[PDB]
């Protein structure tokens, strides 16, 4: 398309939700190609990962970590006015993994305290896509204080198996996966600081041995369980989109399965089946679909489980609805 | 499928065998859906993973790390009675990855010391599958003590390729491959203790390393070398299961190749072809075939080769036959 | 049978270091043939990093990794491998495109003032990891650079899913290596006399599991700046990529790969439309790209730790003209 009939085409202005929710959306496209525009300040800000009251000085997209999931379909422009306030101290970009070209956006859209900048992708490809702050000289830095989230680029016909089955999801979940380097003290007590700057040096170390100390979803231990478990009910279908910008990560539904799972994140590549554990390499995001089938707790983890129960990268699903005997029944309670 | 409709159904009770052999089992199913009884005692027992005698309080199922290998075809009912014994200490339970609801009946599992349970699932979706103990509050902690093992569940057609045509294996092994995380004292060499629960505290630092000690196929470093290598012949058809509880692990036959790899484990997604290294994440279990065309030895690892070579993650393959000079010849054997 | 196999054409091939590879046809011209190669294993130390960090490699054909060696299906490759006397250590190799005695390694055992020619037949298609492999200090010797990979073309190039063919306009092979470096009590990297003198100190290092450098080329920055891989829009390139040790996810920052082999065996259908991708330690893949965008981009190991702090960071300098369709910038950063 050319610039005028870019210009031509109908703007839609989409409001941004908090992860694990998702914005408003169409899983079939809405006619022809659209300008979606988006807008987020990157606010700086000590976030508390864990019951210790551990402090991280955290770079957050829309004030979350993870940043919030965007959703376009494909050949839908994505339009991002991104604006950093006068009370951060650093300059932030954003990289899109989505996007095709200047380091995915990096390049266009360095923006100081004070400064904002509007970029326009086309969305060519479809899938989830990890998107994160990479300003030069400190790109890792930046990542790993959370400065990432994702996009989903649906196909304009809405989601199908490998077969071309529709795959119609009732719910869809955000979870953003983060690994964090918090100095510790010669007790082995984790360091606070007053100023984002002054934890650089000390969290530059602990980076270098490739060892989180904490392995988190939405930002804390303890994010997605208890009352901020993500719900769904026998007979629902869900999509959980998972991404982790840095490190590897292996999601695993306890209780449940990976029906359809898109491991890769990319739709084009057709989904793997009937999943136990899959597997999303640092740098990308994946998508599981799974419809309930037994009410109940489940958990949602990174299957190293020293990184789900050690170090904090478990989630719960509550369930509603009736008990299935048919599917697993106790013949014997535990007794005597 | 009704209470009145399962209890008319035929029951077979199968003898568990120890790793890295499998039970007496039919590639394709014979007959209409079972009940197929597997009983297993958990047994808390010190074993010696190494040469140097290093020791771990081991979680056991059925005695054996890994635990065995459960065979079903998809659409049998799994059913388990779980023994854990009053000369133990501890509560155990079992998750099976292969099972729908209650945390992979994890949550119907529960028995102290002294106490048995029965539970029965059934087997919707074909694959190899991790199972493994999960108590709340203590589960990678029982994981990497040995407390795990897999099933498969046999499509009722037996195995196929991706596109139509039969596989059918001459022989199976089963590979449970183990991170064990050995505190050491203060000049590097491994500790013992007189209780499991004496180890706990220090085991869980090691743990918090993510660096395991030693990485074992069947329990030791060793194990499955000498005469209790593996074998097979020239022409023979092996199908290797692979599972991995807790963390990631890239299998390879040195020397040969996985001709069929279904890396996910799950017989409805096609299986890759013609890999040299396959990758299974943690939580787990994948499946390779293989047709033999070289005798000789084989070293079958972990290809991290530290892992493989220095933390103990190598098996050996003894293959009886004639050689082929045509897949390989030494033109000029090593001379001056 | 006996007299095909030596009916066949003998072909000697000129190798050339990574990140370049030799001369050869996608599509495989004639019948199958006895493609030859010689590579002589170096014991040399060589600098990795900007603070002068040494390693005594061990490096086929003088770099680390070793050259990328180009066949076609049910080609043999038949390799002469020469360990000068000048060595002090015996080495071999294990080819993974390979069937028999442990890739070859077995057959290639060569001290010092030896060689050997080990023939095997290219029976599967796809991009494969080969490695110095001595009975007892296999990882030692990987880790100290003594792998490369080598290209199995299908007779008929490569394809898509849908059979389509896929014409590459180059390509490049960057081999991917985790270093162990021993450091001193003060944090300072330790030097050695010769390559057995740091074995003890080395294995130390590699139990924790954390290497000390990730690198492409053999170097950090080996290629960027004046090194960086080049590329113009439209043009098609295949990016080999190689780790015989360790885990990584390629990632080319303002790019994808349109097709990838992640598995680097062509049977597999390649993924597409990837961000990152991810090849397992003891592998490699293979990545299919078209230029759409002229500037700078980065080539990564998705770990960015291991990206930016470790060394495994390469770039793309791509000329061509600028697609606003594709991206714009709508208001250029301002007060
Ligand atoms: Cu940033
Ligand atoms: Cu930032
Ligand atoms: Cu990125
Ligand atoms: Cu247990
Ligand atoms: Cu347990
Ligand atoms: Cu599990
Ligand atoms: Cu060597
Ligand atoms: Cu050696
Ligand atoms: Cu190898």
């Given at each position: 398309?050319?610039?005028?009939?870019?210009?031509?085409?109908?703007?839609?202005?989409?409001?941004?939700?908090?992860?694990?929710?998702?914005?408003?959306?169409?899983?079939?496209?809405?006619?022809?190609?659209?300008?979606?525009?988006?807008?987020?300040?990157?606010?700086?800000?000590?976030?508390?990962?864990?019951?210790?009251?551990?402090?991280?000085?955290?770079?957050?997209?829309?004030?979350?970590?993870?940043?919030?999931?965007?959703?376009?379909?494909?050949?839908?422009?994505?339009?991002?006015?991104?604006?950093?306030?006068?009370?951060?101290?650093?300059?932030?970009?954003?990289?899109?993994?989505?996007?095709?070209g200047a380091l995915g956006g990096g390049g266009l859209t360095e923006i100081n305290p004070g400064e904002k900048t509007i970029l326009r992708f086309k969305a060519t490809?479809?899938?989830?896509?990890?998107?994160?702050?990479?300003?030069?000289?400190?790109?890792?830095?930046?990542?790993?204080?959370?400065?990432?989230?994702?996009?989903?680029?649906?196909?304009?016909?809405?989601?199908?198996?490998?077969?071309?089955?529709?795959?119609?999801?009732?719910?869809?979940?955000?979870?953003?996966?983060?690994?964090?380097?918090?100095?510790?003290?010669?007790?082995?007590?984790?360091?606070?600081?007053?100023?984002?700057?002054?934890?650089?040096?000390?969290?530059?170390?602990?980076?270098?041995?490739?060892?989180?100390?904490?392995?988190?979803?939405?930002?804390?231990?303890?994010?997605?369980?208890?009352?901020?478990?993500?719900?769904?009910?026998?007979?629902?279908?869900?999509?959980?989109?998972?991404?982790?910008?840095?490190?590897?990560?292996?999601?695993?539904?306890?209780?449940?399965?990976?029906?359809?799972?898109?491991?890769?994140?990319?739709?084009?590549?057709?989904?793997?089946?009937?999943?136990?554990?899959?597997?999303?390499?640092?740098?990308?995001?994946?998508?599981?679909?799974?419809?309930?089938?037994?009410?109940?707790?489940?958990?949602?983890?990174?299957?190293?489980?020293?990184?789900?129960?050690?170090?904090?990268?478990?989630?719960?699903?509550?369930?509603?609805?009736?008990?299935?005997?048919?599917?697993?029944?106790?013949?014997?309670?535990?007794?005597?």
């Amino acid at each position: 398309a050319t610039a005028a009939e870019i210009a031509a085409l109908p703007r839609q202005k989409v409001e941004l939700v908090d992860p694990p929710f998702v914005h408003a959306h169409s899983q079939v496209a809405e006619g022809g190609p659209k300008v979606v525009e988006f807008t987020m300040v990157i606010e700086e800000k000590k976030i508390v990962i864990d019951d210790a009251g551990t402090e991280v000085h955290a770079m957050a997209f829309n004030g979350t970590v993870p940043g919030p999931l965007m959703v376009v379909h494909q050949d839908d422009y994505l339009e991002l006015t991104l604006i950093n306030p006068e009370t951060n101290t650093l300059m932030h970009n954003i990289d899109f993994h989505a996007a095709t070209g200047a380091l995915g956006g990096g390049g266009l859209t360095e923006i100081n305290p004070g400064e904002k900048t509007i970029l326009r992708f086309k969305a060519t490809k479809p899938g989830v896509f990890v998107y994160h702050c990479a300003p030069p000289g400190m790109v890792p830095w930046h990542v790993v204080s959370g400065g990432n989230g994702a996009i989903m680029v649906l196909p304009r016909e809405g989601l199908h198996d490998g077969k071309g089955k529709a795959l119609t999801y009732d719910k869809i979940y955000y979870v953003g996966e983060q690994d964090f380097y918090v100095p510790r003290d010669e007790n082995g007590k984790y360091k606070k600081y007053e100023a984002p700057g002054d934890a650089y040096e000390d969290t530059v170390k602990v980076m270098r041995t490739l060892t989180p100390t904490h392995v988190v979803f939405n930002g804390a231990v303890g994010a997605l369980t208890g009352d901020k478990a993500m719900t769904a009910a026998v007979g629902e279908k869900v999509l959980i989109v998972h991404s982790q910008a840095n490190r590897d990560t292996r999601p695993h539904l306890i209780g449940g399965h990976g029906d359809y799972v898109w491991a890769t994140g990319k739709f084009n590549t057709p989904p793997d089946v009937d999943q136990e554990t899959w597997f999303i390499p640092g740098g990308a995001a994946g998508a599981a679909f799974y419809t309930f089938q037994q009410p109940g707790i489940y958990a949602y983890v990174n299957h190293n489980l020293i990184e789900a129960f050690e170090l904090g990268a478990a989630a719960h699903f509550k369930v509603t609805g009736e008990w299935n005997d048919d599917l697993m029944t106790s013949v014997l309670a535990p007794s005597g």
